[PDB]
Amino acid sequence: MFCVQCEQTIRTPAGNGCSYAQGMCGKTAETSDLQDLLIAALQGLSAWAVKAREYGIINHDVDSFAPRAFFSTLTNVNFDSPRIVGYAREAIALREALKAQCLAVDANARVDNPMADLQLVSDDLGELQRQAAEFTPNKDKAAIGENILGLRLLCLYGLKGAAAYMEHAHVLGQYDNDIYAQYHKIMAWLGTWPADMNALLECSMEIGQMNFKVMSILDAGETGKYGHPTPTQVNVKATAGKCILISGHDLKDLYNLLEQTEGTGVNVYTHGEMLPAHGYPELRKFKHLVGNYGSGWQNQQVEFARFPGPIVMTSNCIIDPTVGAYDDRIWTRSIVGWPGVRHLDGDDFSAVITQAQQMAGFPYSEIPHLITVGFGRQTLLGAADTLIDLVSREKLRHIFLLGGCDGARGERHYFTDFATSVPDDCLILTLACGKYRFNKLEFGDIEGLPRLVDAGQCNDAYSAIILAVTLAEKLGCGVNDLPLSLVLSWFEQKAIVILLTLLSLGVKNIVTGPTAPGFLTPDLLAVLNEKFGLRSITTVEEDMKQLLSA
């Protein structure tokens, strides 16, 4: 068992990632090995899906399936082993079903597909299954250059994050077929174990390109489904009676859970990456979504435990529910999976509504306290020519992007401290669950424009990127001539992929912490420090000064 995709892998002097028996995040050898097999099935599929060789044409099913499956191998998404084997099941079903369509035409020359992952068919039963040992991401650990492995992983791990966005784009109603072609090529090529440090870097930038396309399209879905987030204040206190809290990234599930509970008199609370839902007008319309509860995925355990009603996990950042003994009342949706905790497929929430009604709910409201959220792609560009004014009257000193995931380690204090200690004459543009790091602390404004400007969700770095571009557009300059640096936090594959696209956009002088990834060797991350000056955090006061100045 070996993977290292999260900011929280095993972290040791010798080596990088989690091997051993279990993950740090609760995945077992079983899963994390089975997940490897699913990735291999998946990669083969994608190689046959690259099979519109001249005009072999495309099946939306395969296209639209591949990300959704890959998404399950993601961190804190899925830890139920059967589910994962089953994703592999139907990957191969469609590789085979796919093969037939092309095979009625020219009998695939000499080789239908020259592929490592090939047909990759499999035998049955889980424990006795795990022959995925042949597929682990580092079977050639020392049989390939260690720096080649690092680029390789950051290429796959990265693409993973992109697929998450492809899906929770798709689901919100949008895809593109050229993107799908690019997905499959990249996945197909990653299938074939190959490692050429030149093309790994160069196909780690192209993932960046693609990820932007798809974040393009996913910000396209959110705006079109539920409006353009306009700036909006959210209560983070508890209120009144019975409640269901919904966590994760899928706005669809909240719009449904909202209609279904419409005047049922049970209330909706968001948590984690569901916060920025609140800014969306066709979603904030509801009088029952009361507030937003708790903070940061890193502590579901002790907070979900305290929340009266049931919890609905839309996607990602789920951990072991057994600890807080709330496993009866967590409902995994979509591709989220945890063994033995109820999975709610279908768009019928009434199961969990009635469950919410059985429970305590809240005993009162607390004296409320609101934060401000939903600086939309739209509403951010709204700000720009006033950002440029404020800067152009030495009112706005420089803009700071405190961003990316929350994790668990105390070393994350950095982000909180960084944020308060940003000087009183410059903005924060935050955008992720690490928003929760400094999010409820007091910030003030610069002439009305709030100093803490939430942009929404990890997936909304696309918003942040686009603000910068329109600032560079406007100030006749270039993206890092801009008076903004980026001090991003990170935890999983989506934030890897945002780093890729940020790098691919060519934004130089990024500051990931609170540590840098497990598969980036001091060599390699020094190569990134060659090409893009990407440096780690480690110190709040130093890094403040470095960044303010010319």
The stretch near ligand SF4 (CB under 6 A) out of 15-23, 45-53, 118-126, 269-277 is 15-23
184 annotated as belonging to a binding site for a ligand: no
Phi and psi angles of residue 489, each rounded to the nearest 5 degrees, phi first: -90, 170
- Comparing C-alpha atoms, which of 454, 453, 457 is closest to residue 396? 453
- Tell whether residue 9 is a contact of ligand SF4 (CB under 6 A): yes
Residues 6+ apart with CB under 8 A from 469: 479
- Cα 456 to the center of its chain, rounded Å: 13
317 annotated as belonging to a binding site for a ligand: yes
- Tell whether residue 18 is a contact of ligand SF4 (CB under 6 A): yes
- Tell whether residue 4 is a contact of ligand SF4 (CB under 6 A): yes
32, 72, 78, 247: residue in contact with ligand SF4 (rule CB under 6 A): 32
- Nearest distance from C-beta of residue 35 to ligand SF4, angstroms: 9
273 annotated as belonging to a binding site for a ligand: yes
Tokens of 281: 């007008």
Antiparallel, parallel or unpaired: β 428-430 and 445-446: unpaired
Q: Give me the torsion for CA of 466, 469, 470, 475, rounded to 10°.
A: 160
Q: Are 362 and 221 in contact (CB under 8 A)?
A: no
Question: Sign of dihedral through CA atoms 310, 312, 317, 322?
Answer: positive
Which positions from 449 through 488 interact with ligand SF4, judged by CB under 6 A? none
Report the alpha-carbon distance of residue 403 to residue 513 in Å, rounded: 10
- Tell whether residue 23 is a contact of ligand SF4 (CB under 6 A): yes
545 annotated as belonging to a binding site for a ligand: no
202 annotated as belonging to a binding site for a ligand: no
Q: Is 530 helix (H, G, I), strand (E, B) or coil?
A: helix
The H-or-E segment that residue 297 falls in is none
- Cα 475 to the center of its chain, rounded Å: 31
Q: Are 273 and 254 in contact (CB under 8 A)?
A: no
Report the alpha-carbon distance of residue 67 to residue 173 in Å, rounded: 14
- Cα 410 to the center of its chain, rounded Å: 22
492 annotated as belonging to a binding site for a ligand: yes
- Tell whether residue 6 is a contact of ligand SF4 (CB under 6 A): yes
Q: Give me the torsion for CA of 64, 69, 74, 79, rounded to 10°.
A: 150
Number of residues that bind ligand SF4 (CB under 6 A): 14
Of the pair 9, 136, the CB lying nearest ligand SF4 is at: 9
Of the pair 27, 412, the CB lying nearest ligand SF4 is at: 27
24, 359, 370, 544: residue in contact with ligand SF4 (rule CB under 6 A): 24
- Residue ranges of alpha helices (H) inside 279-399 are 300-303, 350-358, 377-391
6 annotated as belonging to a binding site for a ligand: yes
- Nearest distance from C-beta of residue 76 to ligand SF4, angstroms: 7
The stretch near ligand SF4 (CB under 6 A) out of 5-13, 233-241, 407-415, 531-539 is 5-13
By rule CB under 6 A, what string of x and - marks binding of each residue 65-104 to ligand SF4?
----------x-----------------------------
- Tell whether residue 17 is a contact of ligand SF4 (CB under 6 A): yes
- Nearest distance from C-beta of residue 231 to ligand SF4, angstroms: 35
Of the pair 9, 267, the CB lying nearest ligand SF4 is at: 9
Q: Which residues are documented as binding site for hybrid [4Fe-2O-2S] cluster?
A: 249, 273, 317, 405, 433, 458, 492, 494
Q: Which residues are documented as binding site for [2Fe-2S] cluster?
A: 3, 6, 18, 25
The site for ligand SF4 (CB under 6 A) is made up of 3-6, 8-9, 17-18, 23-25, 27, 32, 75
Q: Which residues are documented as binding site?
A: 3, 6, 18, 25, 249, 273, 317, 405, 433, 458, 492, 494
